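Pasting as-is:
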Amino acid sequence: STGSATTTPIDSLDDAYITPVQIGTPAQTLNLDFDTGSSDLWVFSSETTASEVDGQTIYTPSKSTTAKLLSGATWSISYGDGSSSSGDVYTDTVSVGGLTVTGQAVESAKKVSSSFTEDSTIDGLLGLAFSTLNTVSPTQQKTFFDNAKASLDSPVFTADLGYHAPGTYNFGFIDTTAYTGSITYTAVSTKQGFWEWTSTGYAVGSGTFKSTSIDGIADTGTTLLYLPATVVSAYWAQVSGAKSSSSVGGYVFPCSATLPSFTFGVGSARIVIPGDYIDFGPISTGSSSCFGGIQSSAGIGINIFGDVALKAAFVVFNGATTPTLGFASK
């Protein structure tokens, strides 16, 4: 079997992408943020504190004939941005673009932090990192991909994110028309629970490629590209007026600038991020300064190939026994 679902930016800046997911019977459609940097499928629900819900569509397990409470299990998660959520766990039938998994753990939020409440377009998250990062306790649960894996034609899912435009998440197959050239694969370490790999280097604009190993994670749930300070400083040094701002939280540059591209290595292959993708957006409508799409990972502990990087490629998350990541230009 396979699944194919369109993913859409939540706003004009591509702050996040939402993909419709059907939960329960009759189906209840929620717009979830597909996150390869986490492993919990959690939703805003009829259990979420009323004061913490603002326009989101909620999952109502009492109206689902296939919902079962996973009694004695709870979840609690913290994300890299300081946001968090917790509640209890149900199992229910979950479908993504025609692909159905019965008995998928659906983590019902009782409490969500302000960031989630203020984001009216995101009804929850659908984690796609390794199931070892799932927070359900005591019984750790599997991700939708892990549960679907055996029924898929091939144990893979692909991310084809758009720049200021819709894209696609496919499960079980590779769409050969979605990319140019070929898909180059690279090794994955599952030790930290992420799709962790090593980039072979980088280039700034039309400069010479620098061969250097950069460990990082492929994270659809992170908006920007976070790389070592050395790399990030070499990129922003090419932009007049670019500087790090403590009030804004990173590199800003005059919105007047046309940015150079940024190339990253995948084995002996290259993925080029156009300068427009790195021109993330103005710090406000009408602002002098624009926020950089490439930022330093110095405060985080890990380099993150977030949406700014992934939207420039067709990405294959190969979930076979020895996982690998594939990147193709598009």
